[PDB]
Amino acid sequence: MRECISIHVGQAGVQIGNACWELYCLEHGIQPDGQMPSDKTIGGGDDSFNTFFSETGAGKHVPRAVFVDLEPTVIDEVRTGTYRQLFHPEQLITGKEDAANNYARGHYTIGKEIIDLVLDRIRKLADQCTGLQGFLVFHSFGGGTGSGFTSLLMERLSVDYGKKSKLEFSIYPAPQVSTAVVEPYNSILTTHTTLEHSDCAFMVDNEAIYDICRRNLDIERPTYTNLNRLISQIVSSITASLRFDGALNVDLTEFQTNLVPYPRIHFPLATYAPVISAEKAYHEQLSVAEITNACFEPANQMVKCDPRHGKYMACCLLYRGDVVPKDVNAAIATIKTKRSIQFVDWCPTGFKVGINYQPPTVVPGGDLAKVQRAVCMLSNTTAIAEAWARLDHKFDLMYAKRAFVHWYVGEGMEEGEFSEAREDMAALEKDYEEVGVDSV
Amino acid sequence: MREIVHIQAGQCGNQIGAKFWEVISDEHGIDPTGSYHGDSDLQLERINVYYNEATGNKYVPRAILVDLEPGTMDSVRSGPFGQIFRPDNFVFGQSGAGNNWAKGHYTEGAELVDSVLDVVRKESESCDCLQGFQLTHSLGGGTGSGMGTLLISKIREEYPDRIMNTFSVMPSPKVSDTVVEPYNATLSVHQLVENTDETYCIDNEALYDICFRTLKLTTPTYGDLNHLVSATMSGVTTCLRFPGQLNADLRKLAVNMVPFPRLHFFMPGFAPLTSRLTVPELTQQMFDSKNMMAACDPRHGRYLTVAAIFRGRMSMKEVDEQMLNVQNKNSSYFVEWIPNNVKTAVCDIPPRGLKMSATFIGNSTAIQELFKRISEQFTAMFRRKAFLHWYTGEGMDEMEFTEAESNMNDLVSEYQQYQDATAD
Amino acid sequence: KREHEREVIQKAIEENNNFIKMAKEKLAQKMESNKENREAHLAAMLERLQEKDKHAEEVRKNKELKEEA
Ligand SMILES: COc1cc2cc(c1Cl)N(C)C(=O)C[C@@H](OC(=O)[C@H](C)N(C)C(=O)CCSSC)[C@@]1(C)O[C@@H]1[C@H](C)[C@@H]1C[C@@](O)(NC(=O)O1)[C@H](OC)/C=C/C=C(\C)C2
Numbered sequence: 001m002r003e004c005i006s007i008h009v010g011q012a013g014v015q016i017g018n019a020c021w022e023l024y025c026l027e028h029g030i031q032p033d034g035q036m037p038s039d040k041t042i043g044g045g046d047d048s049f050n051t052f053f054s055e056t057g058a059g060k061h062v063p064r065a066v067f068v069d070l071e072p073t074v075i076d077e078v079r080t081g082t083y084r085q086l087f088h089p090e091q092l093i094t095g096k097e098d099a100a101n102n103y104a105r106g107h108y109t110i111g112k113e114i115i116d117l118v119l120d121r122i123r124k125l126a127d128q129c130t131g132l133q134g135f136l137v138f139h140s141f142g143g144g145t146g147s148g149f150t151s152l153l154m155e156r157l158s159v160d161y162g163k164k165s166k167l168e169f170s171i172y173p174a175p176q177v178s179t180a181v182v183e184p185y186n187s188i189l190t191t192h193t194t195l196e197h198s199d200c201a202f203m204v205d206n207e208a209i210y211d212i213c214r215r216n217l218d219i220e221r222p223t224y225t226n227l228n229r230l231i232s233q234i235v236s237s238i239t240a241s242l243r244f245d246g247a248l249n250v251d252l253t254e255f256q257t258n259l260v261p262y263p264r265i266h267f268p269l270a271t272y273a274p275v276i277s278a279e280k281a282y283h284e285q286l287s288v289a290e291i292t293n294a295c296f297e298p299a300n301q302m303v304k305c306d307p308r309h310g311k312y313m314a315c316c317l318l319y320r321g322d323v324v325p326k327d328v329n330a331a332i333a334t335i336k337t338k339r340s341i342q343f344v345d346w347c348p349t350g351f352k353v354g355i356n357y358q359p360p361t362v363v364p365g366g367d368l369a370k371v372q373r374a375v376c377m378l379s380n381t382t383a384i385a386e387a388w389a390r391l392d393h394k395f396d397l398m399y400a401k402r403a404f405v406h407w408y409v410g411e412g413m414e415e416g417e418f419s420e421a422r423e424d425m426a427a428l429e430k431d432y433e434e435v436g437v438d439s440v
Numbered sequence: 441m442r443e444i445v446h447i448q449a450g451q452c453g454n455q456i457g458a459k460f461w462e463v464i465s466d467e468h469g470i471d472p473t474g475s476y477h478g479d480s481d482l483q484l485e486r487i488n489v490y491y492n493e494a495t496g497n498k499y500v501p502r503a504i505l506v507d508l509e510p511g512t513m514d515s516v517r518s519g520p521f522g523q524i525f526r527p528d529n530f531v532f533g534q535s536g537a538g539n540n541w542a543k544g545h546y547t548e549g550a551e552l553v554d555s556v557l558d559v560v561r562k563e564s565e566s567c568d569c570l571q572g573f574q575l576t577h578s579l580g581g582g583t584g585s586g587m588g589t590l591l592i593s594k595i596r597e598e599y600p601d602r603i604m605n606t607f608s609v610m611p612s613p614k615v616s617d618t619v620v621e622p623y624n625a626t627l628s629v630h631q632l633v634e635n636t637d638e639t640y641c642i643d644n645e646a647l648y649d650i651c652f653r654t655l656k657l658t659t660p661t662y663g664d665l666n667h668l669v670s671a672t673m674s675g676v677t678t679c680l681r682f683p684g685q686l687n688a689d690l691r692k693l694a695v696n697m698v699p700f701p702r703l704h705f706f707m708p709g710f711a712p713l714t715s716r717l718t719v720p721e722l723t724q725q726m727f728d729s730k731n732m733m734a735a736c737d738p739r740h741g742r743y744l745t746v747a748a749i750f751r752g753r754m755s756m757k758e759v760d761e762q763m764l765n766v767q768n769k770n771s772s773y774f775v776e777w778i779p780n781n782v783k784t785a786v787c788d789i790p791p792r793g794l795k796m797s798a799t800f801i802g803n804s805t806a807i808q809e810l811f812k813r814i815s816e817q818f819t820a821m822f823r824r825k826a827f828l829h830w831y832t833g834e835g836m837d838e839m840e841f842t843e844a845e846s847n848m849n850d851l852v853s854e855y856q857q858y859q860d861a862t863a864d
Numbered sequence: 865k866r867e868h869e870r871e872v873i874q875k876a877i878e879e880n881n882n883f884i885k886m887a888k889e890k891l892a893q894k895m896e897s898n899k900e901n902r903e904a905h906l907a908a909m910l911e912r913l914q915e916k917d918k919h920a921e922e923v924r925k926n927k928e929l930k931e932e933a
């Protein structure tokens with residue numbers, strides 16, 4: 001019951017999927033061959049981790065996940081890698097020719113050739129569910145598959161599963177690790193097309209993750225491996241309420257009620273702490289008060305923006321590990337006093353709090369210190385619109401000259417789709433302004 | 441998995457084509473017999489991009505050798521790696537083209553084109569996922585310039601959804617005394633601008649000036665020029681041949697490098713250029729005019745897009761800092777209406793003999809200086825209709841020379857347009 | 865009250881279905897427009913290439929006409 005199917009699209013989606021599922025396994029005590037000694041109910045069960053893992057009669061715990069990429073090399077490494085036994089081959093779907101960093105090829109030319117197969121494999125997972133809650137879609141904004149195929153899939157999922165919940169983990173592009181000049185195009189196109197088909201979307205600014213790795217972990221030049229291991233911790237904190245259960249645990253759907261005041265305003269800002277090296281964490285007890293304070297330092301945000309220069313519509317705190325309500329309430333009280341957290345006038349100011357007693361886990365060889373307690377803040381702030389504004393500016397500079405537009409037209413798209421998508425974005429930036437205005 | 445089909449046409453095309461295969465074969469650890477004796481698995485990771493695998497673990501270049509003159513075939517065949525190539529992939533006539541573009545495009549070459557295509561089809565049919573083709577040729581001759589552009593058009597007819605890439609060698613009075621080279625070049629450019637997705641401009645003028653001024657070679661040979669070409673060709677194809685992220689295939693390169701379909705003529709660059717370094721030094725030189733393989737000054741135009749490729753063991757932190765340094769210090773020479781137009785890749789495998797190198801691929805509006813030079817030499821003869829009878833004798837019309845001249849002038853104007861363009 | 869309760873739930877059904885419907889139609893329309901546009905782009909490309917072949921025939925025809933004279 002309350003099963004959740006994960007869909008990982010494109011390189012970024014897949015490789016982040018590798019990090020996440022590796023982390024999930026270590027958190028639940030699941031071996032690379034899928035075995036879980038602590039699980040005494042063989043062949044099935046209705047425990048909390050069963051929302052993310054199905055069970056075979058042989059005792060194998062299988063991720064409720066699909067991996068999709070229009071080229072095989074990234075998923076092939078999953079097929080031959082450390083956790084190859086973890087997945088059934090039909091969960092790992094591949095093409096031959098990728099989208100070449102083109103949204104058009106991902107949504108149309110190449111994507112149409114594999115979409116039916118993907119939906120069939122997703123259906124096979126859905127049929128295993130006694131009470132499917134919804135989907136988690138992992139993808140990049142910039143890639144052709146991450147942008148184009150994801151939009152195609154999201155459209156199709158709304159048709160085949162109605163208003164079943166669909167959550168996104170979207171990788172927002174950064175020049176330090178970008179691989180295409182047209183990522184602003186692919187970004188605006190996929191955001192426009194997916195907007196009405198997504199209920200909630202957590203944006204991950206690669207530059208924000210890049211900086212956190214450089215400043216807080218002293219990684220000279222972060223790799224995708226460095227970025228992904230940090231992202232997985234944030235994804236883990238958000239899904240922990242689904243995979244574990246405790247007295248103080250608060251389901252992600254309850255937070256979602258507070259985080260989305262209007263359908264289009266569904267992009268929460270994530271902030272995670274503590275991100276600290278083993279060297280620095282040694283003989284350093286990070287209190288509930290200290291990590292909660294860190295959530296309001298913009299340097300720790302998943303998206304580069306300034307909430308101090310915006311208004312709050314919601315503030316959620318997702319704690320895990322050695323944390324009790326008393327300390328949390330004290331820490332918040334201190335913050336509400338010291339920090340100026342300004343809400344819009346039409347929402348209450350109380351912070352919604354959740355606590356999972358299971359402490360954070362780290363993967364071997366990682367740079368993150370294993371801490372006794374961590375927190376992820378999910379806030380709805382008008383400041384997130386900054387990320388739209390930056391992308392929209394880059395989009396405009398190129399589109400004014402129609403730079404690279406022929407690559408899209410040549411694959412069947414029209415200029416009208418570009419202007420249509422950009423206008424939706426302009427309306428979205430405007431919506432975020434409007435919600436921040438005081439009432440009459 | 442993503443196979444490229446190599447084609448080399450004419451004397452020049454085959455010469456640089458041969459050298460290209462010698463160099464990358466060494467990099468990938470292939471011997472002249474086609475056997476693998478290498479030390480790193482990175483060599484064989486993407487070997488199928490350029491090499492077919494045969495019985496007994498033999499690696500055969502997916503290469504097609506073409507010429508209207510049978511002499512070229514023997515020279516290659518009796519070359520160092522001549523025995524590596526597929527015998528049936530040798531396609532040749534007898535009569536030669538004799539520096540006549542019309543002969544290679546309409547007459548002599550048109551007779552031979554079908555037998556070439558048959559070889560192309562057989563190679564392509566066996567491709568798991570053909571990404572496209574790359575041609576090596578000159579624009580000054582008649583076979584490489586004339587039949588090469590014909591082959592492009594015919595191949596594009598049967599594979600219209602595949603990438604067409606070319607390594608075009610531009611003529612210069614400093615290396616060749618044939619006077620109709622501006623005719624052949626202009627007629628070729630007229631074809632390239634319409635039917636290729638990305639063209640590397642190899643300028644003999646630039647190759648000569650480098651060998652004479654920089655390398656200090658009093659009398660540069662064709663072997664001295666090709667040494668540069670092979671080093672360049674090895675560099676710009678590094679991202680294709682080894683496991684990587686940036687521009688790992690021909691289409692992704694084209695998307696990053698070609699903002700407008702006609703403006704696909706690249707200015708390659710290499711560093712270090714030496715004959716008998718730090719990351720800042722490598723970066724300085726690769727953006728230096730003295731290191732460009734096209735006789736153009738990038739400070740006389742603006743970069744639309746740039747692909748930089750660093751090879752060797754170095755600090756990626758240092759590379760990232762320096763590449764940012766160049767763009768900030770030379771921001772005026774990068775168009776502002778294409779954000780983040782400079783992409784950088786780093787391969788751990790250095791080329792033969794070097795500890796670390798840097799390959800540069802630029803789409804600069806300063807490339808017009810190259811086309812302007814040809815246009816000036818072209819018009820000087822066409823205004824008086826000189827040597828025209830050799831072309832019209834093959835059935836051509838004067839209006840076709842007019843159109844080629846006009847289209848080339850248009851290309852220049854279009855580069856000037858986006859050079860003069862601003863954001864605001 | 866009972867009638868209103870029925871009217872609410874069947875309105876929810878109607879809106880969910882109308883969403884599914886319009887999404888299905890929007891997509892089929894988009895995939896059809898894209899198909900026609902891409903084919904037209906390819907058709908035009910070949911059309912130009914086939915006129916090059918025709919031109920080439922005229923060149924060889926013109927040579928043959930110049931020869932004997
Ligand atoms: C003063 O007048 C000249 C007289 C001649 C050549 C030149 C001038 Cl300016 N030069 C320097 C040119 O560049 C024009 C032509 O070049 C050459 O054919 C190359 C360079 N070659 C091998 C030689 O010139 C031999 C040394 S003579 S030194 C003065 C050329 C290419 O322009 C013609 C047309 C396009 C060719 C000629 C020919 O090669 N075959 C053909 O069909 O078209 C044809 O049949 C095989 C042979 C041509 C030879 C001659 C007409 C000699």
Ligand SMILES: Nc1nc2c(ncn2[C@@H]2O[C@H](COP(=O)(O)OP(=O)(O)OP(=O)(O)O)[C@@H](O)[C@H]2O)c(=O)[nH]1
Nearest residue numbers: 010011012015098099101140142143144145146224
């Ligand atoms: N955080 C993170 N970002 C990634 C990763 N891999 C790629 N990206 C980002 O994703 C963007 C490019 O999209 P990709 O996922 O690589 O491309 P794709 O989805 O496979 O689509 P194709 O064009 O068909 O290859 C760039 O902005 C990258 O920085 C990753 O492993 N982690």
Ligand SMILES: Nc1nc2c(ncn2[C@@H]2O[C@H](COP(=O)(O)OP(=O)(O)OP(=O)(O)O)[C@@H](O)[C@H]2O)c(=O)[nH]1
Nearest residue numbers: 450451452455537538539578580581582583584616
């Ligand atoms: N860089 C370089 N240029 C060459 C080489 N060989 C020929 N060229 C140049 O190529 C141009 C055209 O000559 P070719 O390529 O030999 O002519 P072709 O393609 O064989 O055509 P035909 O001789 O008419 O059959 C000339 O201007 C030469 O300068 C070479 O080995 N290296």
Ligand SMILES: [Ca+2]
Nearest residue numbers: 039041044045
């Ligand atoms: Ca169980």
Ligand SMILES: [Mg+2]
Nearest residue numbers: 010011071098
């Ligand atoms: Mg990909």
Ligand SMILES: [Mg+2]
Nearest residue numbers: 450451509583
């Ligand atoms: Mg020759």
